[PDB]
Design a protein around this ligand. Structure first.
Ligand SMILES: [Cl-]
Ligand SMILES: [Mg+2]
Ligand SMILES: [Mg+2]
Ligand SMILES: [Mg+2]
Ligand SMILES: [Mg+2]
Ligand SMILES: [Mg+2]
Ligand SMILES: [Mg+2]
Lengths: 204, 241, 244, 196, 250, 195, 231, 243, 226
């Protein structure tokens, strides 16, 4: 009934020293029924990464929408969109559906190509921006993620240390949520290299 | 030669319908003058009642747009009233939307933009009028802003409009060359009206009775027009010195 | 009423021609020459900027060659402002298609869409047509490398090599003479520049009077790269081919 | 809310409390419920604050545009504009407005416009939640052609009782006097009116 | 009533000319000279304040207009057409950009939007083209400083330096000799004043000349303090006094 | 309607769909084919609210056939599935949404690969080796999870499908009157007339 | 000349040529006569045939039980205007339980025709109408021109050669107005009036069309052998 | 040339020839007048009797707007009716919103803006009527006259149509000889005389006199037609003066 | 949320806490609730957070265009009128509750705005879940003719009352001071009385603790040349 918890799933993003990390589970379900273990919730437009939790049809729709919009942006601007700018675009796009919204919990992550500054941001379904320094969480195990992130996180983590922190935050949060899990992916993002890692976790 | 019938460019880059609208401006054969005091803005205009059957109280080209803004028009009365009604509507809408009284210069700009549209859109003709807006603005003080059929507008220290505008303009120019200030250094509006009338008499070379003139005065928080008896008192003071 | 001033832009002449289309084509004939040459391993787009100035900021300037998406580009001949209206519409159509089918738009489908828009202005609405002729250079996985042209009539055709704008009669003869089917991109680059150098109304062909682009599978493995040449890169290829 | 308007010899006086509540919380204890739509045409507002403010603003706009064209409007004309808005939009409004004004020709006039959007011209009017408690008092104590001082006392005593019994009313008693002489604002504090 | 002119008023003649655009350009030619010069650390735009009457207050008539905090515009041709274009340019910078991306548009894209409006008046039903050429100077983070010209047709070109209107041919020749890629902003202002003096007949001072720059951020003009990233507008209109100071070193 | 199953094997996609049509109290038909051929190498099965199912399926069919004629070219299964998803995603926020769930079984002639797409009425698309809609998966997925291999033959896929249908016939309360089975491969679409 | 291209253009002498050209179409139309007494009102119309095989074009149209008209000019325009009258008569009856006054019917026709003379794109109506009716103020006869001018009259005639019938009625004015409570004699006067507009041809059985309305007489049209009595 | 072919086109003079051509239609029309009296207004019109077949007193020309305003016009009669219909809509919406009946000056501008609007576009034709109108409101009596251009002024006396010069001269005498003012009953008599005197310009055909009046004392500020004995008394007075 | 506004001698000050919540969960511990409508017109928002930010940006955008059009600095009454007419049109469905404060050529101003479109004038105001705690402080200590320093003290004390006593409010105090004839000074994190204490333990993991299935380089760069 509740559109934000029919399909399930989670996204978490963290900042580190000259790097950001964004991660998600791979589950798609119809309430109790597990349907797919390959439903990735993180996407990228140039160097800007977007995670989206919530109703899966809207996850797909919004990805296709932001691909559409960042492609036109690039053609006109003659440059790839930046995280700060894309964050405002996501906010604007969600709020234009104020009284008929997409049932999603988006999470932006990336590094500004000019300043080199790590950037993360989160949104509610209606476009309100949460620009946290430390971490952003979203999905059906957001409470669990808040608990994990609040205790595990420390500032200025190196890329390979940040990987361990965000991975453990996601995994243990997902294992306390019925509608999350079935695999996980972690992106480690640096100014000019991005590493993608699939995690081994319990499949129940 | 249909480039002279509608508002499109001639080969010279001219808009003939705009130019002919300027000529309609002088069809009434009336001259108007506007000057600024310290605390006020005065506008005077010739009043001509050629027919004895006319009710002279209804013959007017000065309009009370808002409480603060007054407007004198140079041109035919139907277009004058068209502009007057619109300006009143715009001034009222502005106050409702933005919560404060529409400034004289902002109204002038708005009416100038409307006029500009008639010079660009073919189906709308220009209005054959020149609009002189006056007030005592709460930010800028005494203000004179004038609009024409080209959609042009600008602020004025003083101004004149009509067939004999040049004679009045030069007369005013020469006075401000002497005084070296942007206004009439006078306390009371009564004496600023006396100045306005005196300098129109000098420029045009004609004497005026109380029924030959029409006077509008802008002060802080109100614009008002003078009655024939108020003007008579003004003419008496001029003659007694 | 208003009828008096109506030029009637969408009518036939007694001979069965569309007045405004014909006069728009006359307008395009005075525009800078644009040439497209299709090779087996890529496409070349070469175009001449019209009598420029020394104070024109060339490196940030774009009047001839425009990007529609990552696979398709166009060369413009005619009113630049008119072209940009159409270009933006084409860019949107490509994105609408990509969003719908999750695949890049096939070149012909995009070309047909823009050409249909041009056609509409000649049949209804009472508006003047777009004074623009396009050369479309593009790639898809069905037909591979493709060259098309469209003009204000809304008619489009496919080509191995083609010119639009000024001196197309002279240009098309020169291309027809030296073009071969087994030709390669580097050879096509040379042919394009040689053709412009002979047909130009200017005294000499220089880097500051040119825009240049290549669509190559000369991208690392099975994929396509668009290259809009920079002023210095146009200067280099002019020296390489032996024109300056 | 406790509001009233009373005609007298020299014109009309509007009276009101200053309490605005959200449930049992007093959101504003110094509210001005006496609002100006024209120089000498004012109104008392009761019901939805959003609605009555929106209506009053629209009326003020209409009377300003009226004045630009046709000169000073009558109190009856102002009441008609209020009525038109309240009646035609009755399904989406919760507004109880008393309109009071001073002409030189007609002198002091009072019009009340209840929820339905009907109009009632009266010698005096009372409205708002607190008015219920003073129907008896006002009916017994009102006289026509009172003096300014008598009318001020009548309103002060009336609203004092309305405030005393109605929890939704309170704060200061604001009044606005409309006569040929001009527009006079009056205020009366708790220490003054509670001991009456 | 109804706008019954639903057909184009600009059409191709047999020779391929668009008459109304050419005639609009002729109107621009009659207009007062304005110019723009781009430096390494700024851009300058300038024009003459041709006062229609000495009784008129020429300060109230702004030929040089702020479009965004980092973009300014000047024109040659019909003033009223310019004034409405500035209104539309200001609004479109918000509606089609700032309300979407939360930041002001880059110079080239705002120019593109202005160009589109001018193109539409060249093709749409029942209208004439705008009788103005615009010079738009601006700055943005990724493109740096830039200067663009926009014509009645809707065509726009980027310039290192240029001039439009009355004495544009002579002025452009003057700018070609003086311009180089190592100019500082003060040097460009100096060249601008020299160039503009040639096309001016009468009085040449800070009260008869309008001049603005796109340069360094002005935190004194921001109106508030507390946000480090907000450093103030790059557009600044030079005062009457500031112009006269540089006319002594002329 | 009720049960629709799909399985992608080595070189083909197999769709099994129930034959029953029940209007409340009575089974009005026991030979209903809940599928439409969208293109020569693309088949779509469907289940959902009465009327909407066939209306939607035929609307999609018409659109794909229109595309086929215009371009003289068959769209890839992926392209068809994306088109279908968008229509359903558009539908869910309409005045009256299409209450239709579909499986799209196609053979991509370019890649030489079978492809099965599962899309529900919300526009929730997933590419799967095997899929179902409604309660069908609850009974069958445990069997498919156990036995399925990506290198299965068409004959082995049919055997695993029979086991799924047998489990449905045993534990489901509703009599769905058996299934019509169709195979989608490089040679096109054919029906298994004995099942 | 240069001012007749459309209805929106005054001539230099203040004339509307398109309206005058529409007026000309009435003069080309077949003659029809209208006349009334204090009790009854009568329409008499000379119907026109294309040839000997063709039928005779109907001239008279019923608008209500108490009102109707005869036409001269473009018949389709009469159909539009009569349809509009039918609706207005019908609106009055349904909404106000009130029979539409003949004078008010004229005012409505005037205003409808007027809008076609002041707006671009349209054209004036190319027909003239003679409206008869019996309402709360007795018998009435109106003459409608597509310029918009509607005129209440004792008697009149419009169409080709209508001047002859109009002069006759102008002489007979004092006689036919007094024909009260005698429908046959009032029709006789109308048939004698329209006879003054005939040349070469005479009134035959399928040529003549007569209509009458009165105090205790609903609007009824007579054609064929029903008018042989009056030939 | 060609400036006079389309409405709303400025000639090189700055004139709108189409409006001036509309005036010619007005000048071609019958004579109509208006007289402002002490506590009201009187309207009168010349009705040309084209034929004996015209029913006397039936083809009424003067029209009432609301209950306090009278309107009369010369020129194209249908155009006048169209203008009055609009006037009635204007007066109805004014009273709907503001309660009070529309003041005469307010009403005058409503017609004025509407007529002026028909000089702004080539898709409409100017009004072929000059309209004399007025009545009694809260500020007393008012008489107006409105031309095809949209131009209007307040008047002591007004006249238009073919015999306007004759009428105007007669009105000017009344203004001079009665500075203190004219009574309503006097104005009715004078109105009858003036129409009879102005009939010399239309002397070929005989005519029918029609008079109406609004007066604070005589009609309670409501518009009424002059009928029966009062009308005959005015006709007798008029017939006595011409002989 | 706790937001307050306080008038003083030569201007006005607004303040706010920095806690944004999702039900009982704290989403952001340092949210910026003080929004800019124009350089010298600032507002603080409570209720639906997206609506407060969205409505201030929209009116702020139109205010900027209006300022450019009229060549005048924006007025608080204009922001007030535009906000209330927008909110009234949407009948409370836009859940924006604002305290608007600023200086302009007319003077210094302080208003509150409710979601249904009603507005109020005052010398001291409070909004949000901690408004009652804040108003208690304001009613206890407010006086006429406050200085700049006294108003900042009072405003921040009122926010503190919300921070400590209201569960919906917490973390830090933001302040903005708008004085006549001066630039408005935004004081981000004016007070910081809620810094988290050092944890008992470091939860930095040994590298290689997480089990990994696959690694790969993601191509963020464009299609390459040659
Ligand atoms: Cl505007
Ligand atoms: Mg789990
Ligand atoms: Mg499980
Ligand atoms: Mg025009
Ligand atoms: Mg409400
Ligand atoms: Mg109490
Ligand atoms: Mg699914």
């Amino acid at each position: 009934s509740d559109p934000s918890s029919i399909n399930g799933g989670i996204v978490v993003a963290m900042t580190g020293k000259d790097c950001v990390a964004i991660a998600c589970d791979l589950r798609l379900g119809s309430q109790s029924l597990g349907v797919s273990n390959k439903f990735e919730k993180i996407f990228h437009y140039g160097h800007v990464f977007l995670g989206i939790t919530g109703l899966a049809t809207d996850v797909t729709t919004l990805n296709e929408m932001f691909r559409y919009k960042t492609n036109l942006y690039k053609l006109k601007e003659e440059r790839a969109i930046e995280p700060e700018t894309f964050t405002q675009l996501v906010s604007s796009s969600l709020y234009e559906r104020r009284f008929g919204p997409y049932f999603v919990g988006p999470v932006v992550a990336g590094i500004n190509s000019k300043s080199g500054k790590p950037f993360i941001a989160g949104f509610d379904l209606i476009g309100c921006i949460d620009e946290a320094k430390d971490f952003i969480v979203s999905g059906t195990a957001s409470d669990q993620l808040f608990g994990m992130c609040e205790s595990l996180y420390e500032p200025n983590l190196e890329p390979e240390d940040l990987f361990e922190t965000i991975s453990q935050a996601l995994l243990n949060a997902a294992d306390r949520d019925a509608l999350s899990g079935w695999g996980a992916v972690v992106y480690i993002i640096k100014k000019d290299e991005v590493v993608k890692r699939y995690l081994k976790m319990r499949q129940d | 030669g249909y480039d002279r019938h509608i508002t499109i460019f001639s080969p010279e880059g001219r808009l003939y319908q705009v130019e002919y609208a300027f000529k309609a401006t002088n069809q009434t054969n009336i001259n108007s003058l506007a000057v600024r005091g310290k605390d006020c803005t005065v506008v005077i205009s010739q009043k001509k009642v050629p027919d004895k059957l006319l009710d002279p109280t209804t013959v007017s080209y000065i309009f009370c747009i808002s409480r603060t803004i007054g407007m004198v028009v140079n041109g035919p009365i139907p277009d004058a009233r068209n502009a007057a009604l619109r300006a009143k509507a715009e001034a009222a809408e502005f106050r409702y939307k933005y919560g404060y009284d529409m400034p004289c210069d902002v109204l002038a700009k708005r009416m100038a933009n409307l006029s500009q549209i008639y010079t660009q859109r073919a189906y709308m003709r220009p209005l054959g009028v020149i609009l002189t807006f006056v007030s005592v603005d709460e930010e800028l003080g005494p203000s004179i802003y004038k609009t024409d059929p080209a959609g042009y507008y600008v602020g004025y220290k003083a101004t004149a409009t009509g067939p004999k505008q040049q004679e009045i303009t030069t007369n005013l120019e020469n006075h401000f060359k002497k005084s070296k200030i942007d206004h009439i250094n006078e306390e009371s509006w009564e004496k600023v009206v006396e100045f306005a009338i005196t300098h129109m008499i000098d420029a045009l070379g004609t004497e005026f009775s109380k029924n030959d003139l029409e006077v509008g005065v802008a002060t802080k928080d109100k614009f008002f027009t003078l009655s024939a008896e108020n003007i008579e008192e003004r003419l008496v003071a001029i003659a007694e010195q | 009423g208003s009828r008096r001033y109506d030029s009637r832009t969408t009518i036939f002449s007694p001979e069965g021609r569309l007045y405004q289309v014909e006069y728009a084509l006359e307008s395009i004939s005075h525009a800078g020459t644009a040439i497209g040459i299709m090779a087996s391993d890529g496409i070349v787009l070469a175009a001449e900027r019209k009598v420029t100035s020394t104070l024109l900021e060339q490196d940030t300037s774009t009047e001839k060659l425009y990007k529609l998406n990552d696979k398709i580009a166009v060369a413009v001949a005619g009113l630049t402002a008119d072209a940009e209206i159409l270009i933006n519409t084409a860019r949107i159509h490509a994105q609408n298609y990509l969003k719908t089918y999750n695949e890049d738009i096939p070149v012909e489908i995009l070309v047909r869409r823009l050409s249909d828009i041009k056609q509409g202005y000649t049949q209804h609405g009472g508006l003047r047509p777009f004074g623009v002729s396009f050369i479309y250079a593009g790639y898809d996985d069905r037909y591979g490398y493709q060259l098309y042209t469209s003009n204000p009539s809304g008619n489009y055709t496919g080509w191995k090599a083609i010119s639009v704008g000024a001196n197309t009669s002279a240009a098309q003869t020169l291309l027809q003479m030296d073009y071969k089917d087994d030709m390669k991109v580097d050879d096509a680059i040379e042919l394009a520049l040689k053709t412009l150098s002979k047909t130009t109304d200017s005294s000499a062909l220089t880097y500051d009077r040119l825009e240049f682009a290549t669509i190559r599978k000369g991208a690392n493995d099975g994929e396509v790269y668009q290259k809009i040449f920079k002023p210095q890169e146009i200067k280099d290829i002019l020296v390489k081919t032996g024109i300056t | 809310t406790s509001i009233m308007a009373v005609t007298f010899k020299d014109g009309v006086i509007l009276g009101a409390d200053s309490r605005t509540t959200t449930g049992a919380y007093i959101a504003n204890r110094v509210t001005d419920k006496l609002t100006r739509v024209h120089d000498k045409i004012w109104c008392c507002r009761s019901g939805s604050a959003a609605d009555t403010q929106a209506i009053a603003d629209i009326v003020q706009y209409h009377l300003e545009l009226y004045t630009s064209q046709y000169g000073t409007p009558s109190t009856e004309t102002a009441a008609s504009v209020f009525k038109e808005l309240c009646y035609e939009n009755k399904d989406n409004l919760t507004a109880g407005i008393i309109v009071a004004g001073y002409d030189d020709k007609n002198k002091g006039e009072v019009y009340t416009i209840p929820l339905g959007g009907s109009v009632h011209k009266l010698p005096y009017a009372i409205a708002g939640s607190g008015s219920t408690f003073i129907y008896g008092y006002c009916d017994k104590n009102f006289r026509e052609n009172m003096s300014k001082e008598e009318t001020v006392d009548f309103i002060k005593h009336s609203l004092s009782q309305a405030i005393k019994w109605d929890g939704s009313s309170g704060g200061v008693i604001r009044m606005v006097v409309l006569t040929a002489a001009g527009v006079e604002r009056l205020i009366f504090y708790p220490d003054e009116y509670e001991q009456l | 009533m109804t706008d019954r002119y639903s057909f184009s008023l600009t059409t191709f003649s047999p020779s391929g000319k668009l008459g109304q655009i050419d005639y609009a350009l002729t109107a621009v030619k009659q207009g007062v000279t304005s110019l723009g010069i781009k430096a390494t650390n700024g851009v300058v735009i300038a024009t003459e304040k041709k006062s229609s009457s000495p009784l008129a207050m020429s300060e109230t008539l702004s030929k040089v207009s702020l479009l965004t905090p980092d973009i300014g515009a000047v024109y040659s041709g019909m003033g009223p057409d310019y004034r409405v274009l500035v209104d539309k340019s200001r609004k479109v910078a918000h509606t089609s950009y700032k309300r979407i991306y939360g930041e002001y548009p880059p110079t080239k894209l705002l120019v593109s939007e202005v160009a589109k409006i001018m193109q539409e008046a060249t093709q749409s039903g029942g209208v004439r083209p705008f009788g103005v050429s615009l010079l738009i100077a601006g700055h943005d983070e990724f493109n740096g400083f830039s200067l663009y010209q926009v014509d009645p047709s809707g065509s726009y070109f980027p310039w290192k330096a240029t001039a439009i209107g009355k004495g544009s041919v002579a002025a452009k020749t003057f700018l070609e000799k003086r311009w180089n890629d190592e100019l500082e902003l003060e040097d460009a202002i100096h060249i601008a004043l020299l160039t503009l003096k040639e096309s001016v007949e009468g009085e040449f001072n800070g009260d008869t000349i309008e001049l603005a720059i796109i340069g360094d951020e002005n935190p004194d003009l921001l109106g508030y303090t507390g946000i480090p990233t907000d450093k103030g507008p790059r557009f600044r209109k030079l005062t009457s006094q500031e112009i006269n100071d540089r006319l002594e070193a002329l | 309607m009720d049960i629709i199953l799909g399985i992608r094997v080595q070189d083909s996609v197999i769709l099994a769909s129930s034959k029953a049509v029940t209007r409340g109290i009575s089974v009005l038909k026991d030979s209903d084919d809940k599928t439409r051929q969208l293109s020569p190498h693309t088949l779509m099965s469907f289940a959902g609210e009465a009327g909407d199912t066939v209306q939607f399926a035929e609307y999609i069919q018409a659109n794909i056939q229109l595309y086929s004629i215009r371009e003289d070219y068959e769209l890839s299964p992926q392209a068809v599935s994306s088109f279908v998803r968008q229509e359903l995603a558009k539908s869910i926020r309409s005045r009256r949404p299409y209450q239709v769930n579909v499986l799209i079984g196609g053979y991509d002639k370019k890649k030489n690969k079978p492809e099965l797409y599962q899309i529900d009425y919300l526009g929730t698309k997933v590419e799967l080796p095997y899929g179902a809609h409604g309660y069908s998966g609850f009974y069958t997925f445990s069997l498919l999870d156990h036995h399925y291999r990506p290198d299965m033959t068409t004959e082995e896929g049919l055997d695993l499908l029979k086991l799924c249908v047998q489990e449905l016939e045993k534990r489901m309360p509703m009599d769905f009157k058996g299934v019509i089975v169709k195979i989608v491969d490089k040679d096109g679409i054919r029906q298994v007339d004995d099942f | 000349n240069n001012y007749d291209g459309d209805t929106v253009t005054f001539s230099p002498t203040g004339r509307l040529f398109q309206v005058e050209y529409a007026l000309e179409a009435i003069k080309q139309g077949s003659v029809t006569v209208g006349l009334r007494s204090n009790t009854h009102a009568v329409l008499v119309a000379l119907k026109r045939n294309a040839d000997e095989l063709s039928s005779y074009q109907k001239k008279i149209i019923k608008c209500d039980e108490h009102m109707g008209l005869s036409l001269a000019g473009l018949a389709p325009d009469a159909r539009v205007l009569s349809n509009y009258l039918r609706q207005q008569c019908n609106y009055s009856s349904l909404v106000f339980n009130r029979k539409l006054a003949v004078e008010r019917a004229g005012h409505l026709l005037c205003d409808k025709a007027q809008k076609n003379t002041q707006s671009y794109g349209g054209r004036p109506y190319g027909v003239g109408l003679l409206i008869i009716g019996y309402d709360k103020s007795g018998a009435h006869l109106l003459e409608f021109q597509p310029s918009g001018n509607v005129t209440e009259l004792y008697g009149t005639a419009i169409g080709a050669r209508s001047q002859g019938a109009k002069t006759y009625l102008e002489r007979t004015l004092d006689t036919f107005i007094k024909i009260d409570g005698n429908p046959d004699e009032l029709i006789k006067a109308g048939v004698e009036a329209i006879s003054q507009s005939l040349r070469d041809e005479s009134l035959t059985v399928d040529n003549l069309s007569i209509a009458i309305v009165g105090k205790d007489t609903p609007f009824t049209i007579y054609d064929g052998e029903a008018v042989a009595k009056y030939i | 040339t060609g400036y006079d072919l389309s409405n709303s086109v400025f000639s090189p003079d700055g004139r709108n020839f189409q409006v001036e051509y509309a005036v010619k239609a007005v000048e071609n029309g019958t004579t109509s007048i208006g007289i402002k009296c002490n506590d009201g207004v009187v309207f009168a019109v010349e009705k040309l009797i084209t034929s004996k077949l015209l029913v006397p007193q039936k083809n009424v020309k003067i029209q009432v707007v609301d209950r306090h305003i009278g309107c009369v016009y010369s020129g194209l009669i249908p155009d006048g009716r169209h203008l009055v219909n609009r006037g009635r809509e204007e007066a109805a919406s004014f009273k709907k919103l503001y309660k009070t009946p529309i003041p005469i000056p307010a009403f005058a501008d409503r017609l004025g803006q509407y007529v002026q609007a028909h000089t702004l576009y080539n898709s409409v034709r100017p009004f072929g009527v000059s309209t004399i109108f007025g009545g009694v409101d809260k500020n007393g009596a008012h008489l107006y006259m409105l031309e095809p251009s949209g131009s209007y002024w307040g008047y002591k006396g007004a006249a238009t149509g073919k015999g306007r010069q004759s009428a105007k001269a007669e009105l000017e005498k009344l203004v001079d000889h009665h500075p203190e003012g004219l009574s309503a009953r006097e104005a009715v008599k004078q109105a009858a005389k003036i129409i009879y005197l102005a009939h010399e310009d239309n002397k070929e055909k005989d005519f029918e006199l029609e008079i109406s009046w609004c007066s604070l004392s005589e009609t309670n500020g409501l518009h009424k037609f002059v009928k029966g004995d009062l009308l005959q008394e005015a006709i007798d007075f008029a017939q006595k003066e011409i002989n | 949320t706790t937001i307050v506004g306080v008038k003083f001698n030569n201007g006005v000050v607004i303040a706010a806490d920095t806690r944004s919540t999702q039900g009982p969960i704290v989403a952001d511990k340092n949210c910026a609730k003080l929004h800019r409508i124009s350089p010298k017109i600032w507002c603080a928002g409570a209720g639906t957070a997206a609506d407060t930010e969205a409505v201030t940006q929209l009116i702020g955008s139109n205010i900027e265009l209006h300022s450019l059009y009229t060549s005048r600095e924006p007025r608080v009454v204009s922001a007030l009128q535009m906000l209330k007419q927008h909110l009234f049109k949407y009948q409370g469905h836009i859940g924006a509750y604002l305290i608007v404060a600023g200086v302009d050529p007319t003077g210094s101003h302080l208003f509150s705005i409710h979601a249904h479109g009603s507005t109020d004038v005052g010398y001291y105001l409070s909004l949000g879940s901690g408004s009652l705690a804040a108003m208690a402080v304001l009613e206890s200590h407010w006086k006429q003719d406050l200085t700049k320093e006294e108003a900042i003290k009072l405003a921040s004390d009122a926010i503190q009352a919300g921070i400590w006593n209201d569960l919906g409010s917490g973390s830090n105090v933001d302040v903005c001071v708008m004085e006549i004839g001066k630039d408005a000074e935004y004081l981000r994190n004016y007070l910081t009385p809620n810094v988290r204490e050092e944890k008992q333990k470091s939860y930095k993991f040994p590298r290689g603790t997480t089990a990994v299935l696959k690694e790969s380089i993601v191509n963020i760069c464009d299609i390459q040349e040659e």
